[PDB]
Each structure stands twice: as C-alpha cells, then as structure tokens.
mmCIF file of C-alpha atoms and ligand atoms in Angstrom:
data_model
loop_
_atom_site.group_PDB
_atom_site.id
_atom_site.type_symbol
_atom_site.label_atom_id
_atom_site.label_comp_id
_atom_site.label_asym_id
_atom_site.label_seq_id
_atom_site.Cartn_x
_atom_site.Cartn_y
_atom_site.Cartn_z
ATOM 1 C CA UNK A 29 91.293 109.697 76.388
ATOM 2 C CA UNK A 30 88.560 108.148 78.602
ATOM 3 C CA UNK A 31 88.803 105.211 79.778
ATOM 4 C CA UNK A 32 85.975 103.488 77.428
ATOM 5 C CA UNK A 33 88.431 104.279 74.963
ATOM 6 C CA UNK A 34 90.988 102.641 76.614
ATOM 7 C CA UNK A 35 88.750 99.772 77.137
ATOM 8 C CA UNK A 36 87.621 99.349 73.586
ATOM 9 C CA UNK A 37 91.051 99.743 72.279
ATOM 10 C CA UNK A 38 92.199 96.941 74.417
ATOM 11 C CA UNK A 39 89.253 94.893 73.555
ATOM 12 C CA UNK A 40 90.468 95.494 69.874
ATOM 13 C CA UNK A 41 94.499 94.458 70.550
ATOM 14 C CA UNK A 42 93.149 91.257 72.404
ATOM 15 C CA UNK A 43 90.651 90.371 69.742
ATOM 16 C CA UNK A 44 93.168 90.499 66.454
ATOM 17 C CA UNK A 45 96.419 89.258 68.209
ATOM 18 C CA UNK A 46 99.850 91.607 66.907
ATOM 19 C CA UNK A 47 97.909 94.468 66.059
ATOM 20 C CA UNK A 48 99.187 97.499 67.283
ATOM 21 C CA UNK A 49 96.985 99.887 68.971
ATOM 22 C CA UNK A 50 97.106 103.539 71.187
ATOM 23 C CA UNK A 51 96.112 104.023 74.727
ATOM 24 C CA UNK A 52 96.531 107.682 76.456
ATOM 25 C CA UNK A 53 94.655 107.713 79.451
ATOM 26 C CA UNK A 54 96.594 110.348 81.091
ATOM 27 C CA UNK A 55 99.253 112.552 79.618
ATOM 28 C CA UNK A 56 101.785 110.687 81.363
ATOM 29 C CA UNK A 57 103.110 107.632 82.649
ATOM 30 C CA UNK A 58 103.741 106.624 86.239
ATOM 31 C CA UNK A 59 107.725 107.159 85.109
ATOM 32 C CA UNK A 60 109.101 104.342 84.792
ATOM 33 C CA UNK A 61 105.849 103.256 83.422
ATOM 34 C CA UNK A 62 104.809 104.034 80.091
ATOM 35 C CA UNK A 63 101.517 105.561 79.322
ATOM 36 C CA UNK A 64 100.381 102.294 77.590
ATOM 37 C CA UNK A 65 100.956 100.057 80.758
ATOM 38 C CA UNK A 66 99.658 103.158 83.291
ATOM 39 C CA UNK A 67 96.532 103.090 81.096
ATOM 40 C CA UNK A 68 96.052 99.088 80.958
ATOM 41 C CA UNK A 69 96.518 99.425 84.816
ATOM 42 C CA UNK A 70 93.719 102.142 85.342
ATOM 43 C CA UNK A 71 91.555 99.948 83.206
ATOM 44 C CA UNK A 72 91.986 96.574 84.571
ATOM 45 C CA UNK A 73 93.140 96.902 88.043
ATOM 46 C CA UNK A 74 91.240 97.856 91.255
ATOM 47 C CA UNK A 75 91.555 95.899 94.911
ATOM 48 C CA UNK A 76 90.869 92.355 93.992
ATOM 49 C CA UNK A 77 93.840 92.212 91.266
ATOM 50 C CA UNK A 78 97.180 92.251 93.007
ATOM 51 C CA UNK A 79 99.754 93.777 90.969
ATOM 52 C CA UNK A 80 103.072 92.455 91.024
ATOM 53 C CA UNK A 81 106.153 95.010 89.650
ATOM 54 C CA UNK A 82 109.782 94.127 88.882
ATOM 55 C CA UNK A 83 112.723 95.551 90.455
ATOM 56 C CA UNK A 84 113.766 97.916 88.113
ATOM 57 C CA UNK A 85 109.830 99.450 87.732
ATOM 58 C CA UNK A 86 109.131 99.220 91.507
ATOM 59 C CA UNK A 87 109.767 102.370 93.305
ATOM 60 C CA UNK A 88 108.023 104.609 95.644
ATOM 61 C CA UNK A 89 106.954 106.810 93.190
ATOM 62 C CA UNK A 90 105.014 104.188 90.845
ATOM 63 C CA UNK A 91 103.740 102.043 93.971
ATOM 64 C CA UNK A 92 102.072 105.473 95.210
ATOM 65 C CA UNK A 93 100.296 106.436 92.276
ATOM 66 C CA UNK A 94 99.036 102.945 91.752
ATOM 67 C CA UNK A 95 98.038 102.914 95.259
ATOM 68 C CA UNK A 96 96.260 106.374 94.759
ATOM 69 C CA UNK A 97 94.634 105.379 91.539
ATOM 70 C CA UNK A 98 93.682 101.827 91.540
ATOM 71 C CA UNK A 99 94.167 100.762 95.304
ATOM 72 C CA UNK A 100 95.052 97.066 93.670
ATOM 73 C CA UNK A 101 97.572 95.260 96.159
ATOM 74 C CA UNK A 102 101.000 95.398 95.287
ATOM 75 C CA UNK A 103 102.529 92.221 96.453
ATOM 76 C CA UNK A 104 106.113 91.663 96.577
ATOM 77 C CA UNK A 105 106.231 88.168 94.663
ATOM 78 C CA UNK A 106 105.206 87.294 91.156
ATOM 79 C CA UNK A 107 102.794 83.952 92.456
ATOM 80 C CA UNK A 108 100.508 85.966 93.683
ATOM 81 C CA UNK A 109 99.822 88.795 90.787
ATOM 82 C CA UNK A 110 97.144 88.797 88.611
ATOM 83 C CA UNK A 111 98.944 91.416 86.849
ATOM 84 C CA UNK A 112 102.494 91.093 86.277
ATOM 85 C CA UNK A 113 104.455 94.789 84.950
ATOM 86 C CA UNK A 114 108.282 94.073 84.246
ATOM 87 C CA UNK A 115 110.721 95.078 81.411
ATOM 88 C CA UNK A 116 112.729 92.469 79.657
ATOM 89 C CA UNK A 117 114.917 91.648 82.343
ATOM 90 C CA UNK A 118 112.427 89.184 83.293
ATOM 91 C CA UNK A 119 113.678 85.842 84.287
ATOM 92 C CA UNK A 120 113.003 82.836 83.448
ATOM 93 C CA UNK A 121 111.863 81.773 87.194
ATOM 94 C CA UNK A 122 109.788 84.893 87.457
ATOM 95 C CA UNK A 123 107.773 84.048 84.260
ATOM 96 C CA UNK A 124 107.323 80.547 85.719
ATOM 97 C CA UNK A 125 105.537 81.952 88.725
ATOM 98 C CA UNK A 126 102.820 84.111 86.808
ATOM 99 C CA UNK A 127 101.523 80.535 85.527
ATOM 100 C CA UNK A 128 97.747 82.274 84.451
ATOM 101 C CA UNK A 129 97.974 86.057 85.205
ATOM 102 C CA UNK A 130 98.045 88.607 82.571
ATOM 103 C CA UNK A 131 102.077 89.645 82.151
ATOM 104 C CA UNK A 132 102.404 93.858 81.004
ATOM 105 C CA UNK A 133 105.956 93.544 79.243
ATOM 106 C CA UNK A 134 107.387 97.411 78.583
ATOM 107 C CA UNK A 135 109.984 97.215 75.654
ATOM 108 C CA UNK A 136 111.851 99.710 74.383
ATOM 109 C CA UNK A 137 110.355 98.413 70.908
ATOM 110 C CA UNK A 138 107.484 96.884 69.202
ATOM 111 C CA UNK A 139 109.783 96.622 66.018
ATOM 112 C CA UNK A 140 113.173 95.584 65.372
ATOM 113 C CA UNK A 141 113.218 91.746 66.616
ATOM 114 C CA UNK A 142 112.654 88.389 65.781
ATOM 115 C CA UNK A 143 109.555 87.848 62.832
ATOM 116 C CA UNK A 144 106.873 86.243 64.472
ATOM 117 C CA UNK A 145 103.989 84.456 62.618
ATOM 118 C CA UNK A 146 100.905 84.324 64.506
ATOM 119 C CA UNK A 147 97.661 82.766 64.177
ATOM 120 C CA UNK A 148 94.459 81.655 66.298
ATOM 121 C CA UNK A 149 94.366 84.377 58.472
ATOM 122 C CA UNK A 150 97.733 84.956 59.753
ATOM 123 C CA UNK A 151 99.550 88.121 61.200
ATOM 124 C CA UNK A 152 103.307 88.877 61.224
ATOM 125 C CA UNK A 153 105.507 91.362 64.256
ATOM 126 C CA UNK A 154 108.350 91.530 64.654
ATOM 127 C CA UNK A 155 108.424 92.747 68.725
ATOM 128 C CA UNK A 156 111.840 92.677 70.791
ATOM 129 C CA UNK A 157 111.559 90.225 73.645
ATOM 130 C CA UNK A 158 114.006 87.995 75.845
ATOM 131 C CA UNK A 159 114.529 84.611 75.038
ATOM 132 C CA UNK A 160 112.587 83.178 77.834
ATOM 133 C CA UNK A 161 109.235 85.313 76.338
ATOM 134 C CA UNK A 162 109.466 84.162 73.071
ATOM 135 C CA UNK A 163 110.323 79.940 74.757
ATOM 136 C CA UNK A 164 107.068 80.629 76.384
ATOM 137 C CA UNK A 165 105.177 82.023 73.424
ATOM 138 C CA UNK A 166 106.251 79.496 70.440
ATOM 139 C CA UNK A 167 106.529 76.152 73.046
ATOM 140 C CA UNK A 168 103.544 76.744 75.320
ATOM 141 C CA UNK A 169 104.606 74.387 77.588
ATOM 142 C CA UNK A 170 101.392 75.491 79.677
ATOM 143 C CA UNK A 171 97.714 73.646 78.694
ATOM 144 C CA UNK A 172 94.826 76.347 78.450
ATOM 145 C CA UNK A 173 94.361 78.232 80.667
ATOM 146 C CA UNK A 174 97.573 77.828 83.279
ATOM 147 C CA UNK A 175 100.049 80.239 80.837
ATOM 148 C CA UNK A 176 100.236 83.846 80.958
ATOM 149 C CA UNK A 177 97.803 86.467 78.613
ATOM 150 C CA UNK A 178 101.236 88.965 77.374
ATOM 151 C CA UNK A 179 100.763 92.814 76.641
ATOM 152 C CA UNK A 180 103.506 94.307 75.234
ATOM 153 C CA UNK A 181 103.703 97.833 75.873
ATOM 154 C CA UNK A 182 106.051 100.748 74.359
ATOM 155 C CA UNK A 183 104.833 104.570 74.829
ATOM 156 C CA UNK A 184 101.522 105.114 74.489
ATOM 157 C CA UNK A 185 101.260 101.881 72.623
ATOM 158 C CA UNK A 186 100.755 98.258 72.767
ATOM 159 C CA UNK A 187 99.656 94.819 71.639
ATOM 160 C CA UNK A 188 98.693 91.526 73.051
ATOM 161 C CA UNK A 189 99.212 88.158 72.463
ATOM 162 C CA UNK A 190 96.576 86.136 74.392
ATOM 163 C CA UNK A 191 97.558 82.745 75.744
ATOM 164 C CA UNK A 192 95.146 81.175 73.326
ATOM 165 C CA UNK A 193 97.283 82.930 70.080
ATOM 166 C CA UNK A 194 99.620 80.301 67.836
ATOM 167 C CA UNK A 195 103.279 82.172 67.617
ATOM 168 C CA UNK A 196 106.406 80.576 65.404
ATOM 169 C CA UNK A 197 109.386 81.872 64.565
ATOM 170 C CA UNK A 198 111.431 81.360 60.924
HETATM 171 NA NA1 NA B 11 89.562 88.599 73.036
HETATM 172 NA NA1 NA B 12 117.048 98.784 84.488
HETATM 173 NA NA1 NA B 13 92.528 89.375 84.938
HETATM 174 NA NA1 NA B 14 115.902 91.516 71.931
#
C-alpha cells in the first residue's frame, strides 16, 4: 500500500482507540521490525523525530534501513525520542523517560491478555503487555499531555491507545 493508506489507516486506529487496523507499506519489515511498526515509521518519521530503539530491535541492519528511508536520528537514549520502538521487555525506567513521545510496542499478540475496557461508547481488547504498560495505561500517573501516545504493533497490524484514552482492567 501507499503511504496515504497508511496514513488514513492510522488516522482511523488513533481516532476509535482498540480498534484493530492493517498497514503494509512494504512487503516486509525491517526484521526485527514488523511491517506494522516499519510502516508507522515511514509515515511519521523523517529528520526532526529522533527515533529511539531497544536493545533487542537495535541492530545494524534496522538502524540502516531507517537511516536510508527516513534519515530520522537514532539516538541511543529513550529521553530524547519522539518515537520510542521496543518489544515488551521494556522497563519500567525506560517508559519513564519517553514522558510525551509516541511509544511503537511490537507484541507477539494483540489477543490473548488481560480484558481491557476503554473509553474516551465503550470498547473492549484484550492485548498482551508487561505490567509496567498496562500501570501506565489504567493509573496515568502523567497529566495531559506529559504521558506517552502507545501503538501496539503485531505483523502487519496494529492499534493505538492515545494518551487521552480511559483504560481499566476487571
Ligand atoms: Na485522533
Ligand atoms: Na529478545
Ligand atoms: Na510526534
Ligand atoms: Na503478557
């Protein structure tokens, strides 16, 4: 797909919170990238929106074709990202320094967790995510706007839940 359609698509995820939607702006992902987060990135990112990646997404490999495709700055440390990519190994102190920038989460699934009840008419998922994600998301302890925007991303799919978005768990 182009990337309009990548744009509107987003546009659609951030707009109904926990709806579920496809991006495929290339056939593949920057490996270990998934096509969801390599398409956010192409659509978002350019030279005045450092990216910040996590360990275990960080290689040469990904850093070059982000550099090739985007030129954004890829800075070594999470307080300076606008865009933050990790998987679920995120820490606790790491999520603390995005607040906010926008946070790209991969998970291995946007199924199979905790229900989550969101509102901001209500909308239920049921997403896997560490502890410290789902602290964040149901406490807020950030006021508007400090916290983090989250896109979750699996495959060629994703969806976001704005800072702005209620979130319990029960
Ligand atoms: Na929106
Ligand atoms: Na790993
Ligand atoms: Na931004
Ligand atoms: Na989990």
């Amino acid at each position: 797909q182009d990337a309009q359609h990548s744009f509107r698509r987003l546009l659609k995820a951030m707009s109904e919170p926990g709806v579920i939607v496809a991006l495929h702006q290339l056939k593949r992902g920057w490996q270990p990238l998934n096509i969801a987060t390599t398409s956010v990135l192409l659509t978002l990112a350019d030279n005045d929106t450092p990216v910040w990646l996590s360990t275990p997404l960080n290689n040469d490999i990904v850093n070059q074709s982000l550099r090739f495709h985007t030129n954004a700055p890829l800075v070594s440390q999470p307080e300076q990202a606008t865009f933050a990519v990790t998987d679920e190994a995120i820490s606790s102190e790491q999520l603390n320094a995005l607040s906010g920038a926008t946070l790209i989460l991969q998970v291995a699934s946007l199924s199979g967790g905790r229900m989550l009840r969101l509102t901001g008419e209500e909308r239920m998922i049921a997403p896997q995510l560490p502890e410290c994600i789902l602290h964040e998301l149901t406490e807020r302890p950030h006021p508007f706007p400090l916290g983090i925007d989250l896109i979750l991303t699996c495959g060629e799919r994703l969806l976001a839940i704005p800072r702005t978005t209620h979130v319990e768990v029960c």
